[model samples]
Target chain A: RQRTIVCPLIQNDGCYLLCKMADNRGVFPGQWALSGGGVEPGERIEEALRREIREELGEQLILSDITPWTFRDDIRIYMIYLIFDCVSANRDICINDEFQDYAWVKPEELALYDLNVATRHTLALKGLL
Target chain B: AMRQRTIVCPLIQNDGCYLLCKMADGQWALSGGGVEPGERIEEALRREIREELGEQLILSDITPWTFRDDIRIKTYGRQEEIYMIYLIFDCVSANRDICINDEFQDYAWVKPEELALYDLNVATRHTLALKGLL
Candidate 1:
């Protein structure tokens, strides 16, 4: 089955929050990525995105402008990347065990980090990088 | 592996009124359906609308007004769980004459204030509330 990944493009002061996956993760371990996970059956994309953000960051997200970008790998692992423009009054984030770290960076600074393949491709496709 | 379902609903508008369909079960609903495997959400939405309403939707009329819900059902004697991620687009029908398929019994072009007058499906009711209509 294709996996749906819904993530928030959390913004505050013209910067975006990017997270680093924990080394223990099964996929893209130790890679820079967005805060999201697989979408369960019968789950809405927005609901999945909100749940993932809450689980990973422990912060409430006020999302606006929902958009989608899709990609597939050689192994036929389909991913529907649901992106939302989000804001949080509280900038402080409490990351869960799945991620090792997080950073807030400008769009130009995105290339400085080693992002996961999907993340990099998506950024470039959307012309964000 | 969790099974995921991608669905789309069209909020077709004309003259400050929204188009709605009545299912055979006598409940009001939107025009859309599940996204076929390997299809983009937008593509699936357009295809579903065409199949359901027999109208080619205006791409620009489709705006990003999304909603989601979860439900459990029994399939093949086994309990299956699924997430229904619904992508709602604001659409416009150039032709007011609708040729609905066999799935629906009737249609209506209702104003926002009149939404409560119809017997909406569970999801449609929630969607209206999300859009601040209810």
Candidate 2:
């Protein structure tokens, strides 16, 4: 299956953190990860991102502000992490059944927990650790 | 004639019920109308609601709900279908007292469970249901 990723940008007076969720599907579905899902056929990545967010969280999100993430892969099989700048619309998290639990942890707190290998490596490479 | 219609959706306090304008066909719809080519969406919604209902209404955030892509293709009259984009909002109508006329028969502040009571259009109903308003 094709995997798409998105990251939520949570900004408060310049400092920011990405909102992520641990999927309850696949190998590490229960692991704390990013927010995103697979792109359907005949659907643009932007549409998929908005639809996924609305499905996960209600339509309280502004889809226009979502920053698009791109990767080069014909048939990718991995987790999808979508990134978007959080607005002042007051994000009230509604837990999807796919996750055991969720948290708005900081970037530094990521290292204190057991994260997937890819996510762990990616965070390190991005110097987010 | 190209007429400019004004519309507004009133919100009720302490209730998820929103204020909707009842159309001639008895459908509870948003308060808005056609713009004379240059009018903005927000302006239209505000104006229509004030004229159809009353004034002093407090408008809330304009939520870009959905767009009705107007498509006109047929061997008929010169009239073309306008794709009415619905930009719903959680607004508060200042005057609960409505003054109805020929264009609108009545108005109501309804909840999701009261969908069947109104003769709403299929598209609008679908949107309301999708947005959990119906």
Candidate 3:
């Protein structure tokens, strides 16, 4: 079986938003990642994406121009990454329990951060790294 | 963990004439199929539409309209219970010339008033009725 992951690329002023995973999280703890989450059963991918952004950022995002990128790991876990271009009117950042911090940086600066493997791979695939 | 079966059903229309396919089970249905593993819904819809209708489509009104059902089938001589989720979307086509694949024998651009004229499957009938087109 395959799992879906929504990776939100919130862009503003030629930069994207990145979130730092909580140290207590199960997977890829204490690393920079996107504002997204997994797709629950019986949930639409887009709907799940919206819910995840709301939960993570505490801001309602207006998403548009969705594009999908797929990758599989050696363990046979297929991840269907749904990438969307998002925008938000609110600039206040409310860190959730799932994430430790957040940052907005140019695409070229992504490589300087301690990103997880998935985030690095996704950024490279999108030609941002 | 329970397995999931994802499918996309496309409602393609042109000038009040909707496109439908004649299934092997002797029922008329929409043009769509199962989503491949690691495939997005929109990508899967486009692939299925291209294989069934032989043309590219521009999808619209892509709201979350899903129908759920269950089926038991034999896989490798073992009975497997599967839960199917149908993700339906409305689409539009610029080209009228359709070339259906082998899974279907015929195609029709049907009108709402004449929907009853075709031998539609139970799901298709229910979907059309739910959409107030039947």
Candidate 4:
């Protein structure tokens, strides 16, 4: 049980960005989740969050209200989640191969989608949904 | 982000004593090593525990603790000198019997008050001080 995951609650207007993982993946594949990843060894939490945003969305973004949330513990991986409020710095999201689909949906609409455990947990703990 | 490597160390305790694995060259430190790109930090520690120590040892109550930076040093898998970041975790173990590999000369359970009596690794000493164990 280890590592810190920086999950960005990308907010534009009143909506948050949710991306669907490719089905070929192992962890929560084919489910809509926050566009972020684990903080690599020797990398700061903030750096990981920004790296994830740039890598997944392929765009520079502004991060604010960086807050540590809950921990995701399972048999395979244990990770601390940091849910930060982020805003897009550019116009469009190019999207990466890791995520097959993405959308900027309102907070109320999050419950309507099949969100991964980390995303659901992040929203519930933050009272977004 | 995964460019720089990190050493994930565990401060395992039992009966108010800490475990210290010694090297052949007279250096002493806690049993730990490198972190893989895909492996979680906990898994990395557990993997190291089983590899260096006995395979039957069980690492429990693993708590993510503070970290200390080990400036540029030589490590396994890399030829060039690199800055190593060490993450010290407060871990618990019920079993005391351990069979160590030849990688280390021997292992000892040193008490906090007696820590000054022995030559401890820089990271281990830093961690003990951080936890107020020293």
Q: Which one wins by DockQ: 2 or 4?
A: 4
Candidate 4 wrongly placed segments (more than 4 Å): A1-129, B1-3, B75-79
Q: Record all residue pairs in model 4 with backbone atoms less than 3 Å apart, i.e. clashing.
A: none
Q: Per-residue error at B22 for model 4, in Å? A: 0.8
Q: What lDDT tens digits, residue by residue, belong to model 4 across residues B42-65?
A: 778888888898877776688766
Q: Summarize candidate 3's per-residue lDDT along B103-127 as a digit string, tens digits.
A: 8989898989999899998778877
Q: Give lDDT tens digits, candidate 1, residues A1-129.
A: 566677676777778788888855455458888776666655566667778878888855445444443332222365555666676655688888768899988989998888987678767865779
Model 3 regions lying over 4 Å from their true place: A1-129, B1-3, B56-79
Q: What is candidate 4's TM-score for chain B alone?
A: 0.86
- Candidate 2 has what TM-score? 0.41
Please tell me which model should have the higher lDDT, number 2 or number 3. Answer: 3
Per-residue lDDT for A1-129 in model 3, tens only? 576566677776677888888855466458898876888876656667778877888765445444333332222365445566566554566778779899988888989998877778778877888
Q: How high is the lDDT of residue A27 in model 1? A: 58
- Model 4: docking quality category: incorrect
lDDT of 1 at A37: 66
lDDT assessment of candidate 4: 0.72
**In angstroms, how far off is B70's CA in candidate 2?**
4.8
Question: Who is ahead in DockQ, 1 or 4?
Answer: 1
On residues B1-134, what C-alpha lDDT tens digit does candidate 1 reach at each position? 45556677888888777888999758998778897877766678788877777764443466555555456464867777665666677676665667788889999989999999999988888778877886
Specify the poorest-scoring 10-residue window by lDDT in model 4 chain B.
Answer: B64-73
TM-score computed on alpha carbons, candidate 1: 0.64
**Model 2, residue A49: what's the lDDT?**
60
Q: Which stretches of candidate 2 lie over 4 Å from their true place?
A: A1-129, B1-14, B56-79
